[PDB]
């Protein structure tokens, strides 16, 4: 739920394990 991944996902995918794309920011929980 929170953008604490230090990653953006404009292309729609996150590479940081445990993080997922809440477009356009990677979020964890």
Method: X-ray
Q: What residues contact residue 14 under an 8 Å CB cut-off, 6+ apart? A: 5, 7, 20, 21, 26
Is 29 in contact with 3 (CB distance < 8 Å)? Answer: no
CA distance linking residue 20 with residue 3, whole number of Å: 10
Q: State both tokens at 12.
A: 């729609």
CA angle (14 as vertex; 3, 27 as ends), nearest 5: 20
Resolution attained, angstroms = 2.3
Would you give the end-to-end CA distance of the chain in angstroms? 4
| DSSP bridge partners of 15 | none
């Amino acid at each position: 739920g929170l953008p604490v991944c230090g990653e953006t996902c404009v292309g729609g995918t996150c590479n940081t394990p445990g993080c997922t794309c809440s477009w356009p920011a990677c979020t964890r929980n």
